[PDB]
Every structure is written in structure tokens, then in C-alpha cells.
């Protein structure tokens, strides 16, 4: 679950990468490589944390 919920952070990073701009654009970025680094550790949690606060950051943008 850990390579699945990476996945997921990856699809949303390209949303952001789509329609965000360019700060955002690195603040979700920071978060995918911070999210590789948790994967590599086996922390799940911070993985699961990882993922809530990408689709949190991709919602602000998408409903902006
Ligand atoms: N302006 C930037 C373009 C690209 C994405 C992001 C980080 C780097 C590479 C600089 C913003
Ligand atoms: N692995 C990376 C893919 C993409 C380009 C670069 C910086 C970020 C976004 C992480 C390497």
C-alpha cells in the first residue's frame, strides 16, 4: 500500500503540475520527493499524511 498511495500522490502532483502554478507547483513537488523519502523509511503514516495534504493543496487550486 505504501507504492499505491505513492502512485496516488503522483497522479495529483500532475494535476497541480497541470493547473497550478508555479509556487504550487514546487510546494507540491517538495511533498512528492518528501513522499519517496516516507516510502523508502516504510512510513505509512507520513506517507497517508502525504496524500491528504496533496489533495488538499490540488482542491485550494481546483476551486480557486
Ligand atoms: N519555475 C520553475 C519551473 C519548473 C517547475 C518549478 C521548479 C523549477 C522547474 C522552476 C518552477
Ligand atoms: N523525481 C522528480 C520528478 C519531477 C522532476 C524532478 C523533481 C521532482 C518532479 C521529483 C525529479
Redesign the pocket.
Known amino acids: 500500500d505504501l507504492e499505491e498511495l505513492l502512485q496516488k500522490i503522483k497522479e495529483i502532483?500532475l494535476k497541480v503540475m497541470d493547473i497550478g502554478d508555479d509556487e504550487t507547483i514546487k510546494r507540491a513537488?517538495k511533498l512528492?520527493?518528501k513522499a519517496?523519502l516516507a516510502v523508502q523509511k516504510k512510513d505509512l503514516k507520513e506517507v497517508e499524511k502525504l496524500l491528504k495534504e496533496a489533495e488538499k493543496v490540488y482542491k485550494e487550486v481546483k476551486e480557486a
Open positions: 502532483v513537488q512528492l520527493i519517496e
